[PDB]
Design an enzyme around this catalytic site. Sequence first.
Site, PDB file in Angstrom:
ATOM      1  N   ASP A  46      -3.858 -13.258  -9.663  1.00 44.35           N
ATOM      2  CA  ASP A  46      -2.798 -12.950 -10.612  1.00 44.35           C
ATOM      3  C   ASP A  46      -3.187 -11.740 -11.451  1.00 44.35           C
ATOM      4  O   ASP A  46      -4.317 -11.636 -11.935  1.00 44.35           O
ATOM      5  CB  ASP A  46      -2.526 -14.155 -11.513  1.00 44.35           C
ATOM      6  CG  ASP A  46      -1.298 -13.967 -12.387  1.00 44.35           C
ATOM      7  OD1 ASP A  46      -0.534 -13.006 -12.151  1.00 44.35           O
ATOM      8  OD2 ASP A  46      -1.097 -14.780 -13.312  1.00 44.35           O
ATOM      9  N   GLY A  47      -2.240 -10.816 -11.616  1.00 43.05           N
ATOM     10  CA  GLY A  47      -2.513  -9.626 -12.401  1.00 43.05           C
ATOM     11  C   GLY A  47      -2.660  -9.915 -13.881  1.00 43.05           C
ATOM     12  O   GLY A  47      -3.287  -9.142 -14.609  1.00 43.05           O
ATOM     13  N   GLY A  72       0.771  -1.227   0.000  1.00 45.25           N
ATOM     14  CA  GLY A  72       0.000   0.000   0.000  1.00 45.25           C
ATOM     15  C   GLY A  72       0.804   1.280   0.000  1.00 45.25           C
ATOM     16  O   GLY A  72       0.265   2.322   0.391  1.00 45.25           O
ATOM     17  N   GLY A  73       2.073   1.244  -0.409  1.00 43.02           N
ATOM     18  CA  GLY A  73       2.838   2.477  -0.511  1.00 43.02           C
ATOM     19  C   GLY A  73       2.244   3.440  -1.520  1.00 43.02           C
ATOM     20  O   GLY A  73       2.107   4.637  -1.253  1.00 43.02           O
ATOM     21  N   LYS A  74       1.884   2.931  -2.698  1.00 37.32           N
ATOM     22  CA  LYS A  74       1.245   3.770  -3.706  1.00 37.32           C
ATOM     23  C   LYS A  74      -0.270   3.778  -3.540  1.00 37.32           C
ATOM     24  O   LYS A  74      -0.939   4.735  -3.947  1.00 37.32           O
ATOM     25  CB  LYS A  74       1.635   3.296  -5.103  1.00 37.32           C
ATOM     26  CG  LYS A  74       3.127   3.360  -5.371  1.00 37.32           C
ATOM     27  CD  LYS A  74       3.479   2.735  -6.705  1.00 37.32           C
ATOM     28  CE  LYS A  74       4.969   2.841  -6.970  1.00 37.32           C
ATOM     29  NZ  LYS A  74       5.767   2.249  -5.861  1.00 37.32           N
ATOM     30  N   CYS A 102      11.052  -0.485  -8.718  1.00 35.35           N
ATOM     31  CA  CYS A 102      12.036  -0.071  -7.718  1.00 35.35           C
ATOM     32  C   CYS A 102      13.341  -0.843  -7.927  1.00 35.35           C
ATOM     33  O   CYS A 102      13.689  -1.768  -7.191  1.00 35.35           O
ATOM     34  CB  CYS A 102      11.484  -0.271  -6.313  1.00 35.35           C
ATOM     35  SG  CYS A 102      12.609   0.233  -4.989  1.00 35.35           S
ATOM     36  N   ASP A 139      -3.043  -7.809  -5.425  1.00 37.24           N
ATOM     37  CA  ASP A 139      -1.686  -8.311  -5.284  1.00 37.24           C
ATOM     38  C   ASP A 139      -1.743  -9.825  -5.145  1.00 37.24           C
ATOM     39  O   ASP A 139      -2.625 -10.369  -4.477  1.00 37.24           O
ATOM     40  CB  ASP A 139      -0.976  -7.677  -4.078  1.00 37.24           C
ATOM     41  CG  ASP A 139       0.508  -7.987  -4.040  1.00 37.24           C
ATOM     42  OD1 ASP A 139       0.873  -9.181  -4.031  1.00 37.24           O
ATOM     43  OD2 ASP A 139       1.312  -7.032  -4.020  1.00 37.24           O
TER      44      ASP A 139
HETATM   45  C1  LIG Z   1       8.339  -4.880  -5.237  1.00 34.44           C
HETATM   46  S1  LIG Z   1       6.722  -5.095  -4.455  1.00 34.44           S
HETATM   47  C2  LIG Z   1       5.952  -3.494  -4.808  1.00 34.44           C
HETATM   48  C3  LIG Z   1       5.012  -3.060  -3.693  1.00 34.44           C
HETATM   49  C4  LIG Z   1       4.160  -1.833  -4.000  1.00 34.44           C
HETATM   50  N1  LIG Z   1       3.895  -1.749  -5.431  1.00 34.44           N
HETATM   51  C5  LIG Z   1       4.841  -0.574  -3.471  1.00 34.44           C
HETATM   52  O1  LIG Z   1       5.768  -0.042  -4.080  1.00 34.44           O
HETATM   53  O2  LIG Z   1       4.482  -0.057  -2.414  1.00 34.44           O
HETATM   54  C6  LIG Z   1       5.900  -6.148  -5.676  1.00 34.44           C
HETATM   55  C7  LIG Z   1       4.788  -7.002  -5.082  1.00 34.44           C
HETATM   56  O3  LIG Z   1       4.023  -7.589  -6.116  1.00 34.44           O
HETATM   57  C8  LIG Z   1       3.542  -8.853  -5.707  1.00 34.44           C
HETATM   58  N2  LIG Z   1       3.456  -9.777  -6.852  1.00 34.44           N
HETATM   59  C9  LIG Z   1       4.403 -10.690  -7.236  1.00 34.44           C
HETATM   60  N3  LIG Z   1       3.949 -11.344  -8.330  1.00 34.44           N
HETATM   61  C10 LIG Z   1       2.728 -10.863  -8.649  1.00 34.44           C
HETATM   62  C11 LIG Z   1       1.834 -11.179  -9.664  1.00 34.44           C
HETATM   63  N4  LIG Z   1       2.137 -12.123 -10.550  1.00 34.44           N
HETATM   64  N5  LIG Z   1       0.632 -10.510  -9.747  1.00 34.44           N
HETATM   65  C12 LIG Z   1       0.325  -9.532  -8.823  1.00 34.44           C
HETATM   66  N6  LIG Z   1       1.220  -9.223  -7.817  1.00 34.44           N
HETATM   67  C13 LIG Z   1       2.403  -9.878  -7.728  1.00 34.44           C
HETATM   68  C14 LIG Z   1       4.522  -9.365  -4.663  1.00 34.44           C
HETATM   69  O4  LIG Z   1       3.819  -9.889  -3.561  1.00 34.44           O
HETATM   70  C15 LIG Z   1       5.319  -8.148  -4.236  1.00 34.44           C
HETATM   71  O5  LIG Z   1       5.100  -7.883  -2.872  1.00 34.44           O
END
Ligand SMILES: C[S@@+](CC[C@H](N)C(=O)[O-])C[C@H]1O[C@@H](n2cnc3c(N)ncnc32)[C@H](O)[C@@H]1O
EC number: 2.1.1.-
Lengths: 336, 106, 55
Positions: free
Chosen positions: A190-191, A138-140, A263, A157
């Site tokens: 899944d996205g 939830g940062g963004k 990031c 997510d």
């Molecule tokens: C690097 S973090 C970014 C967190 C957030 N976007 C932020 O910056 O505050 C990426 C997150 O995406 C999630 N993730 C990994 N694979 C995914 C997928 N296939 N579909 C949706 N989310 C996924 C992971 O749980 C991971 O915690």
Amino acid sequence: PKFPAVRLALQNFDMTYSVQFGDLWPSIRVSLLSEQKYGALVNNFAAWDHVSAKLEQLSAKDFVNEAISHWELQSWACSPNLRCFTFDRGDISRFPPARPGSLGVMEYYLMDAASLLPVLALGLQPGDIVLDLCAAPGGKTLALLQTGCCRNLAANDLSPSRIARLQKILHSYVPEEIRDGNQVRVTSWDGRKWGELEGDTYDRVLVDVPCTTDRHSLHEEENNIFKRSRKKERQILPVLQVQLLAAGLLATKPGGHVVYSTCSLSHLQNEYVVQGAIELLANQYSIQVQVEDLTHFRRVFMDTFCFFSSCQVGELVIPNLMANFGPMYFCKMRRL
Amino acid sequence: GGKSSGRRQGIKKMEGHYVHAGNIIATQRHFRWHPGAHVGVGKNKCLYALEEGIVRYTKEVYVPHPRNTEAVDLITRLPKGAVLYKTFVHVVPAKPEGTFKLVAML
Amino acid sequence: SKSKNILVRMVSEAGTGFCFNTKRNRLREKLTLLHYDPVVKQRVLFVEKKKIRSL
RNA sequence: CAUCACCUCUAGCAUCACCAGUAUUAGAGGCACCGCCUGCUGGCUCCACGAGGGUUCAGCUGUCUCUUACUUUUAACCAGUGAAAUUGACCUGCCCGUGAAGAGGCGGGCAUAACACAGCAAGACGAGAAGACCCUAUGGAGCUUUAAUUUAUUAAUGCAAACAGAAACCUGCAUUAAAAAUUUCGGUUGGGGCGACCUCGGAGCAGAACCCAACCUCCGAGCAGUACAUGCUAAGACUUCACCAGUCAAAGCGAACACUCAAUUGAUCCAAUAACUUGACCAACGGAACAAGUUACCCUAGGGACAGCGCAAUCCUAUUCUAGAGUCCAUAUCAACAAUAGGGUUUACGACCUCGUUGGAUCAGGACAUCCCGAUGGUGCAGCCGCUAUUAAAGGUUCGUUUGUUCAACGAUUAAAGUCCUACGUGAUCUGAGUUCAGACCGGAGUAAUCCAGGUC
RNA sequence: CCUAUACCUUCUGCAUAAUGAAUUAACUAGAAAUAACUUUGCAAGGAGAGCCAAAGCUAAGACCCCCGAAACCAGACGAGCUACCUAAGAACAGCUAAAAGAGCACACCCGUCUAUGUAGCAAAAUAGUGGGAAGAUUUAUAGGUAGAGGCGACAAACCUACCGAGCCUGGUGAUAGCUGGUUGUCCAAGAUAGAAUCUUAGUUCAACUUUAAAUUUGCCCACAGAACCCUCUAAAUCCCCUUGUAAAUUUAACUGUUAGUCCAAAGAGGAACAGCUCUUUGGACACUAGGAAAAAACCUUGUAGAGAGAGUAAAAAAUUUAACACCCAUAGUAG
RNA sequence: GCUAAACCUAGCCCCAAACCCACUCCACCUUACUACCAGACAACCUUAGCCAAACCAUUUACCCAAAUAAAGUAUAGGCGAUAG
Ligand SMILES: C[S@@+](CC[C@H](N)C(=O)[O-])C[C@H]1O[C@@H](n2cnc3c(N)ncnc32)[C@H](O)[C@@H]1O
Ligand SMILES: [K+]
Ligand SMILES: [K+]
Ligand SMILES: [Mg+2]
Ligand SMILES: [Mg+2]
Ligand SMILES: [Mg+2]
Ligand SMILES: [Mg+2]
Ligand SMILES: [Mg+2]
Ligand SMILES: [Mg+2]
Ligand SMILES: [Mg+2]
Ligand SMILES: [Mg+2]
Ligand SMILES: [Mg+2]
Ligand SMILES: [Mg+2]
Ligand SMILES: [Mg+2]
Ligand SMILES: [Mg+2]
Ligand SMILES: [Mg+2]
Ligand SMILES: [Mg+2]
Ligand SMILES: [Mg+2]
Ligand SMILES: [Mg+2]
Ligand SMILES: [Mg+2]
Ligand SMILES: [Mg+2]
Ligand SMILES: [Mg+2]
Ligand SMILES: [Mg+2]
Ligand SMILES: [Mg+2]
Ligand SMILES: [Mg+2]
Ligand SMILES: [Mg+2]
Ligand SMILES: [Mg+2]
Ligand SMILES: [Mg+2]
Ligand SMILES: [Mg+2]
Ligand SMILES: [Mg+2]
Ligand SMILES: [Mg+2]
Ligand SMILES: [Mg+2]
Ligand SMILES: [Mg+2]
Ligand SMILES: [Mg+2]
Ligand SMILES: [Mg+2]
Ligand SMILES: [Mg+2]
Ligand SMILES: [Mg+2]
Ligand SMILES: [Mg+2]
Ligand SMILES: [Mg+2]
Ligand SMILES: [Mg+2]
Ligand SMILES: [Mg+2]
Ligand SMILES: [Mg+2]
Ligand SMILES: [Mg+2]
Ligand SMILES: [Mg+2]
Ligand SMILES: [Mg+2]
């Protein structure tokens, strides 16, 4: 134990990022090994006016407000109703821990100031429907709700554990009345399915694909991407970034904007992924997108951020000793 | 790798069985059997007899409580004339509440 | 596993010495609840005195 | 290994070693002379020398082509003396079949008077002992250490004690260090490496009461939030197949007018507290208050182990199909996708990396799916050679050089230098290597002990 | 002639070519408490002070093995072998050479290679061939260093013919979840759910099994009854009056067993037709006999003796496959 | 019918009772059993460990002077095994 994951992460970065940044890598490496500066994101639902006065007593300055007045000086705008307070350049001062207000919600949130730029670059407008992929923790996600320009939100997510952390953040900060309705939708799917579940549904899509987080990898010893068990995931990580971004691009309606944020400082996961999705859409689905120029965006935030000016499409914010925000990469592409 | 065992949940007293007050009739994950006459429901959807008697299983018309939004939203979307049925378990009391006995001749 | 909540002890203001333990958020002021006191058989004010442990 | 030579480190001194010595000395070590070169320690060269390890000229020879003769011991017989391992009972055949899967004893056939003596070594999974191979033990020991637990001991200090115009010794108590002491290596995944895993909930998962598919595949949980009567008591029941633990609950008192949530958790002892109550990623999650590595120097108690099973996948062989190559031309030959038979092999989960008997000498037995010799069709067979197919196991199938998961390559020949099977056919006939070892280095691994299917002796 | 695959032990299953036994005689292996039961005495009391008692108490009877480690510790005994040292002695031809840890080569010391030998002459030798042989040599004598050690030109060598820690005695009948053994007759009942565990070679609880006792229902089972989902879909199972039957539950006391194997069936293991492994239902086997050739798991059949009686059960593989047209054909035309 | 096979004492075990022995001559701590010369040498100091705790590391019974009883009680103890 055994081989530290921190050293393995540093070894992989040292070989790869020395070529990319040249003489800038020693400057970046010290900032990466040092603690990142925390920005204070004031909660608009809480006593935002009072907290703004409180932070100014701690010598904190709202760089977002300063950047607002610079739009006319230099001569899509940006997401409004955002207030983030950071210290001066070279100031190592840390904000006090957040406290609940009289309304029962936390007064402000501490987060990287470089993570606000993808929200700012999103150019959010009132009455829109926003889709965030990998929204957790939830940062963004919190920043979008702070604006109040999103009537309907879909926070998805893949990891339920990260999702559970997001809901607790929303409960503590966002009042339940907004979360009570269908305005904020939280799911763990899944996205890549979003490219078929809901096509052309959203006007603004923010896709922060999973990636090797340089700040976390060099410090965290738990669930590091560079450990031996996670090597297979790291190899297929660029593949996931291309598929997840493509799903988000298809999810938006034509005439909408999609911001891809990552990031990391790796070019193979910042610029190559952006180009891969553009080619993938045309070849398989015949979809054409246009990447907007962020140079105008960069020149406004040059005062409070350090930027790398050798990027093909997106904008990269590199960490520095005086400005420790980053690393952050974001690219804004609209669908035509 | 997750290892689990069965919860031993189901019917504890079948049709026609004699039960006493407090006897557990059925334990369920979800409302497979709904409480009927003289049958209470616990926190874990556990059905227990509120009276001593014979357990009976019948099919009754299901009319949900108006406050239950999910169930009310279901019946409102049914075609007109449709009626919902669900299995209810009842306890038919066997003994009277009491009897009047002569205690004195004053 | 960050400790968001802490365990505190509420002491009755009725002077009976009855006390009970409740869980409250760490980032919060001292609670003042209205709990039932079995000694006086009525609801009385309680005040947080000492933190027991961090949950 | 030691060794002169070189080099490092330690020590300013005596009445039992060093030493009746004194830094040109003594001790603890590294390296292995010398010579050259080098840093501010490292690399080559070279005299002789060697029961070291390879290579080679010439000669020599029974080592061999290819063995032979004689002598002696042995041997066999006669006379005397007279052991040992071994031994369930034996009235102790062969061929197929069967079978804890390798039959003298079982089934079906065949063979068969009885007995010594001398040979032979195929079998009796021949006999003895040693050893290999893993595995197991809440079995040992050696060694190493940043395993755990300790400083009793010793040394150096501190304070106390004691003397005391000051000082020491001794003693007590602390603090470092040295050298040692006791004890242990938790399970699961063919082994090792690298990783994962151990509790709880859900699904594929036993379609319909309950329970039940380990291993395996996949996703979660180690929270949070709302209450503050989330008070006190009490019938009857459920129960994760035991127990522990867990779950529901009418009535009643007291109030108001058995909280949500699949999991969201941890016993006893002990510790803290006036009481209440609280305390463990005890996550190896029924939990030992606190203990690693290694052994190829190993020890003990045991267990297991070429041969055997394999109609799906894969591979090979022969047919079927008749697309396609072969100028034309399916079928002189060759042959795709496939199918049907015979044979070999692989296989339930880390969609990781690696690793777990065989030649030769002698003697051969057998199969034919024939390398040669023979007979017979077809040919894109003129003839010689070839190609292909049927038939044929009577006979034959060489000698060398390197090298060797012990096999290829090369040389010279031959009518040909066949494919296999037989417990590598055959080690109580012989022998080489490997499995691998007690010594030793080189490379790589480890703090070390030590290790590596690696290289070598 | 016919019939018959030695015994014990260990494994799911041994004729097994798995373990043990040449044979004879003698010797050689189940020790005890609470509770319960059984039979007497006395009885709201019992008992030869103490102790128990809401019928108990007292007494008796009746249940708990053998052999075997590598080890650890304490105290002794050992350097006449060997390792090194001390004391005072001895030995080394001849030749070439030179004042040599020189060369050749005896005595002597060592043990390179090969062969013999392998219960041998010998618990390390013999024959030949070899290295050294004036030296860091060899050797006789006496003394010293002793096991938490000694000594060592480090081979983890040697310290009295098993030294990664001597030997002897004692603790010691050490311990062993491991191997092996466990001795008269006869009858009776008697096999496969699991959980936890430094645990899967073990143990505890449950289940199962046994004995005694008490009580009354037990099994078989007519309807009725037991969920919707993700759309649909199996053999069935639970419950269960009658009825057929005779068991079941409870109380008391304990021991023992557990990866069973194969067959039929339905499945499970990344959506793996067989095979491997693992669940579920049933059967058989670890109990008899007959039949499938021999045969633990298939089929027939089970309650036990004698008979030179009788009727039956299961019970013996089928199959042998390819002939064939006769006759004729000019033309609007190379549409 | 050979080898053999049979035998009944020698003595011993456990108790009771009672507190036992050691100069005939010669030799005997030096190389014991050796007739016969300057010595000065002198004794005393917690047992441990196996084993049990299913490992092991604190701990783990060993007559101490009257049989019985109090009593396996009070206590002790990784408050475990066990000790008492
Ligand atoms: C690097 S973090 C970014 C967190 C957030 N976007 C932020 O910056 O505050 C990426 C997150 O995406 C999630 N993730 C990994 N694979 C995914 C997928 N296939 N579909 C949706 N989310 C996924 C992971 O749980 C991971 O915690
Ligand atoms: K040599
Ligand atoms: K032990
Ligand atoms: Mg050397
Ligand atoms: Mg050669
Ligand atoms: Mg020659
Ligand atoms: Mg001759
Ligand atoms: Mg004779
Ligand atoms: Mg004999
Ligand atoms: Mg015969
Ligand atoms: Mg045979
Ligand atoms: Mg026969
Ligand atoms: Mg033989
Ligand atoms: Mg043998
Ligand atoms: Mg064990
Ligand atoms: Mg050890
Ligand atoms: Mg139960
Ligand atoms: Mg455990
Ligand atoms: Mg456990
Ligand atoms: Mg459990
Ligand atoms: Mg070695
Ligand atoms: Mg011929
Ligand atoms: Mg032929
Ligand atoms: Mg040759
Ligand atoms: Mg050769
Ligand atoms: Mg042989
Ligand atoms: Mg035999
Ligand atoms: Mg056998
Ligand atoms: Mg024998
Ligand atoms: Mg010990
Ligand atoms: Mg021991
Ligand atoms: Mg000597
Ligand atoms: Mg000489
Ligand atoms: Mg010489
Ligand atoms: Mg020597
Ligand atoms: Mg060595
Ligand atoms: Mg060694
Ligand atoms: Mg000896
Ligand atoms: Mg024993
Ligand atoms: Mg065991
Ligand atoms: Mg019987
Ligand atoms: Mg009869
Ligand atoms: Mg015609
Ligand atoms: Mg023990
Ligand atoms: Mg042990």
